Write a protein that binds this DNA or RNA. Structure first.
Ligand SMILES: [Mg+2]
Ligand SMILES: [Mg+2]
Ligand SMILES: [Mg+2]
Ligand SMILES: [Mg+2]
Ligand SMILES: [Mg+2]
Ligand SMILES: [Mg+2]
Ligand SMILES: [Mg+2]
Ligand SMILES: [Mg+2]
Ligand SMILES: [Mg+2]
Ligand SMILES: [Mg+2]
Ligand SMILES: [Mg+2]
Ligand SMILES: [Mg+2]
Ligand SMILES: [Mg+2]
Ligand SMILES: [Mg+2]
Ligand SMILES: [Mg+2]
Ligand SMILES: [Mg+2]
Ligand SMILES: [Mg+2]
Ligand SMILES: [Mg+2]
Ligand SMILES: [Mg+2]
Lengths: 218, 129, 88
RNA sequence: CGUAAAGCGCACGCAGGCGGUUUGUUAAGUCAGAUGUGAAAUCCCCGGGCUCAACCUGGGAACUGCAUCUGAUACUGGCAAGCUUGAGUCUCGUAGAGGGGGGUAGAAUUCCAGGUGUAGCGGUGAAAUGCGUAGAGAUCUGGAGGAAUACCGGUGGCGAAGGCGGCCCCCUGGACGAAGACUGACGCUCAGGUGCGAAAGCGUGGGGAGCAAACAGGAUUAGAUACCCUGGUAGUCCACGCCGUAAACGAUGUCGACUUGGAGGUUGUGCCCUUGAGGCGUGGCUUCCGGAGCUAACGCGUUAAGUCGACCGCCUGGGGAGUA
């Protein structure tokens, strides 16, 4: 049944009453979530997740923190999937139409990186323009092209991603997310208990989500 | 002070409901029961339960349908400070007809649909919808 | 506020037996006792305004209790006030 | 009715209102039916008559009411007998600036007396008035007197509110906890009524160090009936009796039931190799923060300003006036 070796639970006091039903913890000043209730939430989780991924999966593996950002620009990034691994530039969904050209400048630039003007102008402008592009790259990588409108959303840490999720809620976008003992649920349709800032429950489920979009209907 | 228990029922409900509370209990009585009945028989609660003898305990199982609580509102109407009584033709109908009014009569605690058919009337205990 | 020896004595003078402690008549009598005891504390002092509040309480408590009994068993009421000596 | 008009300064309680839970009885409240009555006109519905209309008229409908009779008994009221959780009584303890009385301690101030010692001290923004050559201030020693209790001391504790801080004894009120034992709805609220009620203020007597309305002097100022300075009387202290008001405020009436959380403070108590200065529970009170919810908003938020009930008090534009 279990597969999460050592993600057991996490998070001490800072608990959110509403996250009681998914708790059975009480180990030394910290809750262990209800392991045996998290897995029935891979059922439903990766299910309506894939059930749409074959209907065609457009995702947004949204998850930040200089401590798991790169481990999101991964097979999470790779597949039928888009992502954000830095500061969730607010209104990026709700104001996509303004931000849509924050994109044109990323391309119309890199498309021009080993092309267009580049080694020319000044060797001032140079890295003094790749700073324009470096900045853009993180926070606005995964976006690059959005071909199929943001369709579901998968987030690592419910509340830490206040804004992201809120926006979804506003635009009618499923929001699949894992929620720590401390975080507010109910912002999340398909809620996933368990730790949300340890190198494992990430990768595990993260990489496990990459494994279900990346395959649904050949 | 304990003075009005029927409001307390109506309330413990109203409250617990709003607290998405599974069940709820309280001191029982002939009267509390007759209503817990109509409440169930009209399908506002799952099912009641009286578990005692010297110190009886009414227990109601609440209901939640969509995400909401089934009982959208529950008010007193008569009360010690001010008793209400309606004749048959003057009986009230809640939410135009949807939801109901609990009226005690010379032939027992029954709804407004009920008492209206029975062709009588009494003390209108409370409103539910 | 009265002694265990003294309070006991009166339970045992008024109730069915020591243990029948909460009998109307007993309460009343052990109050009545403390009241009269007190009459000499507030004889001196007098400006013990605070303690006084407690004493009235004792009287108004006793008063309601005496009222109860009367309604209940009038027969027991009259005996009581006679024997305790009040209600001129 | 927190901050806009509005919670009585606080309490106790008569009348009054309201009242847990069970069975029987009653049939007053309540409900049902029947009968009678509810004048005609008017109103309203359908018609009819004046050339139309207003107007006139037929017939219904309606008069939501009242009474009488007979019934129904769930609720309320009455009578009866109970019940134990509401409320009391009982037992051993606990914490406390809760009250009343009496006793007592040290530190300082002022004063009185004396040693040493000598021209200043004191005060301000700066000054002066004041004080010192009859020796001041400074310092040391002895004494008198009154007033308040540093450190502890703390969003600490007690009380109904007012408000209560040295130490000790005596008298005394309340609150809380742990066991079970007793009474058995004895309860909640409360107009009228009664009690209490900071400071100031009044009356007779005391008492008087420091402080200080008034008043006097010195200054500042354009003026200075002030703020500052040097003085200082009522008063501030005690007993007895008055007065009855405060932003007497949480500007939030009392009682009860219900409703996610988080970190403390304080005070009981059960359990754990007491084997840790603790470990896990379980009551009372208290502070901060915050969820729903509530709010005009600020904010409140299990100590509600949320959700409901019982009763009381109070508001109805500003000024006039809490005046006549
Ligand atoms: Mg006001
Ligand atoms: Mg008040
Ligand atoms: Mg009853
Ligand atoms: Mg007529
Ligand atoms: Mg005509
Ligand atoms: Mg009855
Ligand atoms: Mg001295
Ligand atoms: Mg001296
Ligand atoms: Mg005591
Ligand atoms: Mg007085
Ligand atoms: Mg005075
Ligand atoms: Mg005087
Ligand atoms: Mg002066
Ligand atoms: Mg006043
Ligand atoms: Mg205050
Ligand atoms: Mg708060
Ligand atoms: Mg709390
Ligand atoms: Mg309230
Ligand atoms: Mg006047």
């Amino acid at each position: 049944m279990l597969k999460a070796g050592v993600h057991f639970g996490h998070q001490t006091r800072y608990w959110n009453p509403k996250m009681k039903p998914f708790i059975f913890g009480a180990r030394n000043k910290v809750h262990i979530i209800n392991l045996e209730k998290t897995v029935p939430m891979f059922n439903e989780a990766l299910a309506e997740l894939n059930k749409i991924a074959s209907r065609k999966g457009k995702i947004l593996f949204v998850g930040t923190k200089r401590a798991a950002s790169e481990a999101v620009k991964d097979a999470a990034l790779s597949c039928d999937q888009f992502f954000v691994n830095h500061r969730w530039l607010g209104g990026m969904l709700t104001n996509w139409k303004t931000v849509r050209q924050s994109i044109k400048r990323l391309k119309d630039l890199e498309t021009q990186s080993q092309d267009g003007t580049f080694d020319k102008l000044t060797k001032k402008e140079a890295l003094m323009r790749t700073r324009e592009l470096e900045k853009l790259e993180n926070s606005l990588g995964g976006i690059k092209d959005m071909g199929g409108l943001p369709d579901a959303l998968f987030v690592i840490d419910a509340d830490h991603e206040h804004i992201a999720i809120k926006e979804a809620n506003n635009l009618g976008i499923p929001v699949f997310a894992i929620v720590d003992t401390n975080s507010d649920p109910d912002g999340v349709d398909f809620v996933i208990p368990g730790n949300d800032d340890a190198i494992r429950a990430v990768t595990l489920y993260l990489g496990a989500v990459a494994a279900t979009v990346r395959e649904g209907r050949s | 002070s304990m003075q009005d228990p029927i409001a307390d029922m109506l309330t413990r409900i109203r409250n617990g409901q709003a607290a998405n509370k599974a069940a709820v209990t309280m001191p029982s009585s002939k009267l509390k029961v007759a209503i817990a009945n109509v409440l169930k028989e009209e399908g506002f609660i799952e099912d009641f339960k009286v578990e005692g003898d010297t110190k009886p305990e009414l227990e109601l199982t609440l209901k939640y349908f969509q995400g909401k609580a089934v009982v959208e509102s529950i008010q007193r109407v008569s009360r010690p400070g001010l008793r209400i009584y309606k004749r048959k033709d003057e009986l009230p109908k809640v939410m135009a007809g949807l939801g109901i009014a609990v009226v005690s009569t010379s032939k027992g605690v029954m709804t407004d649909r009920a008492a209206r058919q029975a062709g009588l009337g009494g003390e209108i205990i409370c409103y539910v919808a | 506020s009265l002694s265990t020896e003294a309070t006991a004595k009166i339970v045992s003078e008024f109730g069915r037996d020591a243990n029948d402690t909460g009998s109307t008549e007993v309460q009343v009598a052990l109050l009545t006792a403390q009241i009269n005891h007190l009459q000499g504390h507030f004889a001196e002092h007098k400006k013990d305004h605070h303690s006084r509040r407690g004493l009235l309480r004792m009287v108004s408590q006793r008063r309601k209790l005496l009222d109860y009994l009367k309604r209940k068993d009038v027969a027991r009421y009259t005996q009581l006030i006679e024997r305790l000596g009040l209600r001129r």
